[PDB]
Amino acid sequence: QAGIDASGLELRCLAHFMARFDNGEYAHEILNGDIHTKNQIAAELPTRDNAKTFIYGFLYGAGDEKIGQIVGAGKERGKELKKKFLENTPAIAALRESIQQTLVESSQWVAGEQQVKWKRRWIKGLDGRKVHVRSPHAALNTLLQSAGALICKLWIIKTEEMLVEKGLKHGWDGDFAYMAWVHDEIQVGCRTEEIAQVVIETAQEAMRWVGDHWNFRCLLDTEGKMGPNWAICH
Amino acid sequence: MIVSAIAANALLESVTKFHCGVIYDYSTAEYVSYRPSDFGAYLDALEAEVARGGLIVFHNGHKYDVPALTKLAKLQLNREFHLPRENCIDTLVLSRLIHSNLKDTDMGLLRSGKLPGKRFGSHALEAWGYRLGEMKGEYKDDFKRMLEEQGEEYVDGMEWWNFNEEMMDYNVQDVVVTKALLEKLLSDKHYFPPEIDFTDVGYTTFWSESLEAVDIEHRAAWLLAKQERNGFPFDTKAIEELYVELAARRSELLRKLTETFGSNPSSRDHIQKKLQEAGWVPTKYTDKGAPVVDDEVLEGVRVDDPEKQAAIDLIKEYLMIQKRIGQSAEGDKAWLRYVAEDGKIHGSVNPNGAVTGRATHAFPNLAQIPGVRSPYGEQCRAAFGAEHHLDGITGKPWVQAGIDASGLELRCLAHFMARFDNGEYAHEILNGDIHTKNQIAAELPTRDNAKTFIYGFLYGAGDEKIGQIVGAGKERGKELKKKFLENTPAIAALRESIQQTLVESSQWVAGEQQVKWKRRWIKGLDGRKVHVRSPHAALNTLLQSAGALICKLWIIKTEEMLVEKGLKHGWDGDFAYMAWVHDEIQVGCRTEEIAQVVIETAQEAMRWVGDHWNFRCLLDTEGKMGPNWAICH
């Protein structure tokens, strides 16, 4: 079995849409490494693990309770943790500026319901499809997950396409067989270890191909694991 | 850049309330006074200078002003006020850097009567006011005498109890002296070029466009102030658990040393009057008539009286017992008197009161604690360790990491002599057994004799002292040194270039070498002025300056990398600087895993310094993990 996952796809997807405002600054911090270390410094968190649980919660619209419970508090502690990260990472704030104001003209509150005058109730994906959201208060979570899911979808297509092109036959009667696709990771069966090694390399080759295809501003990488089952491939 | 100085109720140890503070801004060219009901706005005005990217000038700020305003903002306003090191300047630090000497220059200021003898060579704000002509009076004296013309008596340290408009007026007075002293330091065109107003510029331009020594001293002073606030944990029970074993031995010996001598084994005017009756003829005397009675001669004093002879070793022990007692249990030091309520000793440190390098430590001198090779030092050294506090919260035993500079003195010599031998001697260090090579080069019998030779010869010992190494006089000394110079030419040529760098020609006239000085200061590793010296020796000044400046940058880069790795500095964190000794440091560490990181980081940090100054010799360190100081060295 060959298990290959997309190395930190979410944060690199964030670097891609924010490379429009920082000229590849945040993107290089991914490649240079320890992006959770930078987020730790930017948001003023004590430990790197606290930065990990921060970056995902903040991006996806978590309030302040989950954030406050990190330091042993409630909804109180959260605002200063979120605003400080915004000041130290302008590009993330600028990211939600042009894009969130690309779908509105002017907004308005009526009886507690925001009656936003929309420009289009749908965010464009990486392939032009309509990806709607709901509230303009975040939407970024929808944008990033759309990028990630559309990246892996093309990724698993080209990987199999290259494997077939190189000479491998798909199925239990050939050389490899897709067993499960789980978002950012895949589980591929392989007849021999040699085939599995090619599977791992091809998936990385396909992942760079996807990034060049959509001219992704950030660099995409993957990591493979060879073994007998799924507990081994992850 | 703004210039300020503050007034509190007491020292940093127990400061409670903020009285007043004045901020002179150069862009507005006008002072601003702050009152007890303006402490909040005072902190904002300093933060505003930080927001613009400028600088804040304090006197004794790295050690007092800045950390006190962090403490005062926590209990009075309950706000997190923290001045970054880069946006802070301490005139006190620059004064000790630029005016490391003063000894000379202050003589004429003393002869002039423009400097109080109590304020000779002092880097205090008031001490400099008389030097620049800005002392219209002192707040302590305009208070004492004014308490007379009012009524109430005076308490040793009461002028800071309550805020009064005269303090507010003398608070401005301290700022204009801080300003004038700052401008007096910026007018030295060897640390600061003749560019423009170095006040007008931002901190980013300030540190880099200034001489490098300016930056190091402020990073060093900032770092050492943290170590004092960290302090060195102290086992009161253990040191107390030493005093009886010393005092009982002192009392028992005193009894025996009064039965042998009827009607104090501690004074020199005593034993001289007593021992010269048991048949001891003093060989070596002193420059005042009285005979020498140190450890050296006492070991060799031979008297026919068996009881008197055996009593000598009892006197030897007595003086040593008094020494340990006189260091661990006496008055106004003794460590036991300095134990703060947190169970730690906060020993103070002067960044570089020693022109060449190596700071000075006092109250108490944490750098003179008896080593583990000296008697009762094993117990003494054990009393100093991070194990005295098992974490400030989690109860986790704090472990100590002791890292020293491996033979730094000889490696500094290889770098400065790499200018004449093309890295030859430096390679002999790496190859190992440099004392073996020096032994072969100087033709010595044992390797230990080579070890004590290389340091003695380098540091200006006479030919007698060199000859006395193998049991001889000045005869063997001259030939021992001359042979070493011939077999190691680079060292001899090194002492030439130095002797022709600070001298033009020398000549003896009725007792004084009349050197036609070309320069009264050797350039260090950062570019600073390093003392003036006087006679033929100077090499010692060069080497100790190099190593200590290496260590100063070393301990800064170590802490910088540890912070850069995520390790928080402090007892509530992962590590805390406890002591800096010459070429070794003692670092407390919360866990063994962290202690291993400290040792590795210190080695890694030693490379940046070695790379920065392009040292021709390899700088290395060795760390030792354990509970206390007796283990880490």
From Swiss-Prot, chain A:
| Residues reported in the UniProt entry to bind Mg(2+) 4 | 5-6, 184
Q: What superkingdom does the record give? A: Viruses
List all membrane-crossing ranges.
none
Q: Per UniProt, where does Mg(2+) 3 bind?
A: 5, 184
**Quick one: which residues bind substrate?**
36, 48, 52, 56
Assembly, in brief, is:
Composed of two subunits. One is encoded by the phage and the other is encoded by the host thioredoxin. Interacts with DNA primase/helicase; this interaction is essential for the coordination of DNA unwinding and nucleotide polymerization on duplex DNA. Interacts with the ssDNA-binding protein. Part of the replicase complex that includes the DNA polymerase, thioredoxin, the primase/helicase and the single-stranded DNA binding protein.
Q: What is this protein's function?
A: Replicates viral genomic DNA. This polymerase possesses two enzymatic activities: DNA synthesis (polymerase) and an exonucleolytic activity that degrades single-stranded DNA in the 3'-5' direction. Non-processive DNA polymerase that achieves processivity by binding to host thioredoxin (TrxA). This interaction increases the rate of dNTP incorporation to yield a processivity of approximately 800 nucleotides (nt) per binding event. Interacts with DNA helicase gp4 to coordinate nucleotide polymerization with unwinding of the DNA.
Family membership, please give it. Answer: Belongs to the DNA polymerase type-A family.
What's the name of the protein? DNA-directed DNA polymerase
Could you tell me which species this protein originates from? Escherichia phage T7 (Bacteriophage T7)
The part of the entire sequence present here spans 471 to 704 of 704
